[PDB]
Write an enzyme that holds these catalytic residues in place. Structure first.
Site, mmCIF file in Angstrom:
data_model
loop_
_atom_site.group_PDB
_atom_site.id
_atom_site.type_symbol
_atom_site.label_atom_id
_atom_site.label_comp_id
_atom_site.label_asym_id
_atom_site.label_seq_id
_atom_site.Cartn_x
_atom_site.Cartn_y
_atom_site.Cartn_z
ATOM 1 N N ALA A 1 3.441 1.490 -10.577
ATOM 2 C CA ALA A 1 3.378 2.856 -11.129
ATOM 3 C C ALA A 1 2.475 3.721 -10.249
ATOM 4 O O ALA A 1 2.788 4.938 -10.017
ATOM 5 C CB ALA A 1 2.841 2.821 -12.546
ATOM 6 N N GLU B 1 4.442 4.456 -6.950
ATOM 7 C CA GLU B 1 5.869 4.851 -7.028
ATOM 8 C C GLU B 1 6.012 6.196 -7.740
ATOM 9 O O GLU B 1 6.782 7.011 -7.274
ATOM 10 C CB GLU B 1 6.730 3.830 -7.784
ATOM 11 N N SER C 1 3.901 8.790 -8.096
ATOM 12 C CA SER C 1 3.337 9.917 -7.314
ATOM 13 C C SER C 1 4.117 10.124 -6.006
ATOM 14 O O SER C 1 4.353 11.256 -5.631
ATOM 15 C CB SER C 1 1.892 9.683 -7.049
ATOM 16 N N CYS D 1 1.513 7.385 -20.750
ATOM 17 C CA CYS D 1 1.105 6.952 -19.392
ATOM 18 C C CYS D 1 -0.426 6.791 -19.287
ATOM 19 O O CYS D 1 -1.142 7.758 -19.492
ATOM 20 C CB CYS D 1 1.558 7.977 -18.381
ATOM 21 N N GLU E 1 -3.473 13.937 -8.392
ATOM 22 C CA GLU E 1 -2.821 13.708 -7.065
ATOM 23 C C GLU E 1 -1.846 14.868 -6.803
ATOM 24 O O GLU E 1 -1.821 15.423 -5.699
ATOM 25 C CB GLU E 1 -2.165 12.319 -6.987
HETATM 26 C C1 HEM Z 1 3.460 11.769 -12.219
HETATM 27 C C2 HEM Z 1 3.047 10.546 -12.313
HETATM 28 C C3 HEM Z 1 3.566 9.776 -13.420
HETATM 29 C C4 HEM Z 1 4.547 9.945 -14.305
HETATM 30 C C5 HEM Z 1 5.481 11.145 -14.375
HETATM 31 C C6 HEM Z 1 4.524 8.784 -15.168
HETATM 32 C C7 HEM Z 1 5.365 8.635 -16.297
HETATM 33 C C8 HEM Z 1 5.205 7.631 -17.209
HETATM 34 C C9 HEM Z 1 5.803 7.605 -18.445
HETATM 35 C C10 HEM Z 1 6.845 8.557 -18.886
HETATM 36 C C11 HEM Z 1 5.388 6.500 -19.137
HETATM 37 C C12 HEM Z 1 5.875 6.030 -20.527
HETATM 38 C C13 HEM Z 1 6.997 4.989 -20.591
HETATM 39 C C14 HEM Z 1 7.364 4.566 -21.983
HETATM 40 O O1 HEM Z 1 6.587 4.453 -22.992
HETATM 41 O O2 HEM Z 1 8.528 4.114 -22.195
HETATM 42 C C15 HEM Z 1 4.446 5.864 -18.247
HETATM 43 C C16 HEM Z 1 3.841 4.700 -18.525
HETATM 44 C C17 HEM Z 1 3.015 4.124 -17.606
HETATM 45 N N1 HEM Z 1 2.502 4.688 -16.441
HETATM 46 FE FE1 HEM Z 1 2.835 6.353 -15.768
HETATM 47 N N2 HEM Z 1 3.532 7.998 -14.817
HETATM 48 C C18 HEM Z 1 2.913 8.534 -13.748
HETATM 49 C C19 HEM Z 1 1.847 8.158 -13.007
HETATM 50 C C20 HEM Z 1 1.255 6.964 -13.229
HETATM 51 C C21 HEM Z 1 0.156 6.450 -12.528
HETATM 52 C C22 HEM Z 1 -0.553 7.125 -11.369
HETATM 53 C C23 HEM Z 1 -0.046 5.179 -13.051
HETATM 54 C C24 HEM Z 1 -1.096 4.138 -12.760
HETATM 55 C C25 HEM Z 1 -2.064 4.310 -11.896
HETATM 56 C C26 HEM Z 1 0.877 5.001 -14.109
HETATM 57 C C27 HEM Z 1 0.937 3.882 -14.858
HETATM 58 C C28 HEM Z 1 1.673 3.770 -15.949
HETATM 59 C C29 HEM Z 1 1.618 2.554 -16.792
HETATM 60 C C30 HEM Z 1 0.892 1.246 -16.542
HETATM 61 C C31 HEM Z 1 2.488 2.748 -17.822
HETATM 62 C C32 HEM Z 1 2.743 1.750 -18.961
HETATM 63 C C33 HEM Z 1 1.698 1.999 -20.065
HETATM 64 C C34 HEM Z 1 1.770 1.267 -21.346
HETATM 65 O O3 HEM Z 1 2.804 0.642 -21.583
HETATM 66 O O4 HEM Z 1 0.814 1.318 -22.236
HETATM 67 N N3 HEM Z 1 1.643 6.127 -14.201
HETATM 68 N N4 HEM Z 1 4.299 6.565 -17.080
HETATM 69 C C1 LIG Z 2 8.621 -1.769 -13.345
HETATM 70 C C2 LIG Z 2 8.221 -0.855 -14.474
HETATM 71 C C3 LIG Z 2 6.731 -0.805 -14.671
HETATM 72 O O1 LIG Z 2 6.097 -1.014 -13.444
HETATM 73 C C4 LIG Z 2 6.215 0.467 -15.296
HETATM 74 C C5 LIG Z 2 4.867 0.135 -15.884
HETATM 75 C C6 LIG Z 2 5.982 1.596 -14.341
HETATM 76 C C7 LIG Z 2 6.364 2.988 -14.809
HETATM 77 C C8 LIG Z 2 5.372 4.052 -14.429
HETATM 78 C C9 LIG Z 2 6.809 3.174 -16.241
HETATM 79 O O2 LIG Z 2 6.219 2.890 -17.246
HETATM 80 C C10 LIG Z 2 8.157 3.789 -16.291
HETATM 81 C C11 LIG Z 2 8.060 5.177 -16.853
HETATM 82 C C12 LIG Z 2 9.135 2.838 -16.946
HETATM 83 O O3 LIG Z 2 8.868 2.710 -18.304
HETATM 84 C C13 LIG Z 2 10.587 3.245 -16.827
HETATM 85 C C14 LIG Z 2 10.956 3.666 -15.441
HETATM 86 C C15 LIG Z 2 11.440 2.089 -17.275
HETATM 87 C C16 LIG Z 2 12.858 2.533 -17.460
HETATM 88 O O4 LIG Z 2 11.404 1.122 -16.284
HETATM 89 C C17 LIG Z 2 10.857 -0.136 -16.641
HETATM 90 O O5 LIG Z 2 10.783 -0.470 -17.760
HETATM 91 C C18 LIG Z 2 10.420 -1.021 -15.541
HETATM 92 C C19 LIG Z 2 11.310 -2.252 -15.466
HETATM 93 C C20 LIG Z 2 8.941 -1.318 -15.703
HETATM 94 O O6 LIG Z 2 8.738 -2.679 -15.865
#
Ligand code: HEM
Ligand SMILES: C[C@@H]1[C@@H](O)[C@@H](C)C[C@H](C)C(=O)[C@H](C)[C@@H](O)[C@@H](C)[C@@H](C)OC(=O)[C@H](C)[C@H]1O
Ligand SMILES: C[C@@H]1O[C@@H](O)[C@H](O)[C@H](O)[C@H]1O
Ligand code: NA
Length: 396
Positions: A233, A236, A238, A345, A354
């Site tokens: 995340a 990818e 950013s 997120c 960023e």
């Molecule tokens: C513009 C940047 C980003 C966008 C638009 C984005 C978008 C998202 C969204 C939509 C989710 C929710 C997915 C769901 O519940 O089904 C998510 C989860 C997540 N994102 Fe981001 N993300 C961004 C940047 C980042 C960054 C910089 C990181 C880590 C350094 C990150 C780490 C994660 C993680 C670990 C989750 C899973 C969290 C959990 O399940 O409690 N994301 N992100």
């Molecule tokens: C590989 C990602 C994982 O790294 C998550 C934590 C990264 C990102 C930022 C996400 O949480 C992202 C928004 C995912 O939930 C979706 C793209 C989803 C359809 O894909 C996913 O669910 C995929 C398979 C997750 O396992």
């Protein structure tokens, strides 16, 4: 069969399949067949309904680990994934690292992050116009920030980037190919974590190694997988969102000129472009109702799965006015580009920082920046769960 295939179409650029506005108006919760697992899912297209699926404890992500549950991606979900945890187990898993990602701590990175940007833009001015903004900014900036935050060696970039692209696969790779990478990425992250065993470090991988030798709620699997999730995340999202916002700015150049004119607009413009941009190409990690749950038009039954389209919720005409127009002067912008509820997120404030600092830097120093390769030739990534450009040649 009866029910329509989802996604509805191979994506083009950042365009949204027109059926989403049709559904928001006439059929905002509708049955679809996802590309993997079995049976049907409710596709949720409106903001109010998305906040319920994402926000309510009567929806379980852990329940969606079952190989039969509909999903957007080839392999069944890793059960050790954060996304696949329900509270309170999930809350405990997130505390492991939440401290680094509070808005106060992320704001403390702004000076280092601004330095890193400026340096990379020097290297791009040295090379001279035209240049590939991907090679010179979009890839190296987030990669350095996540490598320094986690404590992953920066020379491992090609290795972990190849792993992360495979794991973000939608149709590009097969279940077996993806499953193999998952194994290698876990064994790799395991090794970095184990190097802390007699050499602790002041970084997030350091905190994960301490939780491994001292914790009881959290397995070694859950902890290391947190390292994988943050490294994927963390670069990818950013890397892709810089090219997506720069694409949106330069294809209607007045957008870019309007930030050149008032650099202080950049934060609101980032929020608006976060709203507008389908980073997540289609759907979401799935939620399974554990009890009947009332949505706008329908009551989902316990055991029925639901998927959200974030970008469709962010085009909802009952929440945003002229929702289909980019507007940086919007007074109210309650987007779910970062999701909602427990899985909101964790990196949201890092992503914001960023995008602010990349675009602010570009808008200030490069007021002449234009796309220096034709729109028609743009190399959009295909067969991945997210959208972005492989290359973005620019001139100044
Ligand atoms: C513009 C940047 C980003 C966008 C638009 C984005 C978008 C998202 C969204 C939509 C989710 C929710 C997915 C769901 O519940 O089904 C998510 C989860 C997540 N994102 Fe981001 N993300 C961004 C940047 C980042 C960054 C910089 C990181 C880590 C350094 C990150 C780490 C994660 C993680 C670990 C989750 C899973 C969290 C959990 O399940 O409690 N994301 N992100
Ligand atoms: C590989 C990602 C994982 O790294 C998550 C934590 C990264 C990102 C930022 C996400 O949480 C992202 C928004 C995912 O939930 C979706 C793209 C989803 C359809 O894909 C996913 O669910 C995929 C398979 C997750 O396992
Ligand atoms: C199945 C799904 O897809 C793979 O990319 C990732 O390894 C993700 O971590 C997993 O749960
Ligand atoms: Na899923």
């Amino acid at each position: 069969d009866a029910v329509p295939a989802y996604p509805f179409s191979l994506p083009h650029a950042l365009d949204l399949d027109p059926h989403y506005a049709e559904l928001r108006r006439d059929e905002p919760v509708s049955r679809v067949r996802l590309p993997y697992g079995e049976g049907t899912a409710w596709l949720v297209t409106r903001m109010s309904d998305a906040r319920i699926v994402l926000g309510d404890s009567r929806f379980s992500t852990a329940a969606a680990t079952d190989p039969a549950t509909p999903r957007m991606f080839p392999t069944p979900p890793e059960p050790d994934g954060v996304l696949a945890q329900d509270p309170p187990d999930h809350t405990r898993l997130r505390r492991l690292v939440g401290k680094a990602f509070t808005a106060r701590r992320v704001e403390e990175m702004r000076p280092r992050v601004r330095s890193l940007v400026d340096s990379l833009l020097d290297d791009m001015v040295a090379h001279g116009s035209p240049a590939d903004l991907v090679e010179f900014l979009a890839v190296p900036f987030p990669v350095a920030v996540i490598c320094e935050l986690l404590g992953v060696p920066l020379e491992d970039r090609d290795l972990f980037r190849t792993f992360s692209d495979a794991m973000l696969s939608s149709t590009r790779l097969t279940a077996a190919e993806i499953q193999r990478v998952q194994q290698d990425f876990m064994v790799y992250m395991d090794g970095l974590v184990a190097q802390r065993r007699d050499a602790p470090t002041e970084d997030l991988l350091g905190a994960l190694a301490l939780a491994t030798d001292n914790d009881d709620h959290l397995t070694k699997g859950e902890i290391v997988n947190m390292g994988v999730s943050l490294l994927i995340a963390g670069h990818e999202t950013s890397v892709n969102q810089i090219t997506n916002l720069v694409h949106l700015l330069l294809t209607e150049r007045k957008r870019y000129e309007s930030l050149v004119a008032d650099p202080a607009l950049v934060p609101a413009a980032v929020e608006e472009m976060l709203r507008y941009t389908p980073l997540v190409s289609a759907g979401s990690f799935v939620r399974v109702a554990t009890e009947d749950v009332e949505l706008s038009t329908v009551t989902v039954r316990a055991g029925e799965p639901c998927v959200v389209h974030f970008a469709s919720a962010n085009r909802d005409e009952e929440v945003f006015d002229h929702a289909d127009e980019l507007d940086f002067h919007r007074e109210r912008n309650p987007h779910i580009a970062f999701g909602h509820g427990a899985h909101h997120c964790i990196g949201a404030q890092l992503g914001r920082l960023e995008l602010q600092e990349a675009l602010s830097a570009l808008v200030r120093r490069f007021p002449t920046l234009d796309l220096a390769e034709p729109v028609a030739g743009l190399k959009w990534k295909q067969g991945m769960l997210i959208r972005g450009l492989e290359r973005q040649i620019v001139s100044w």
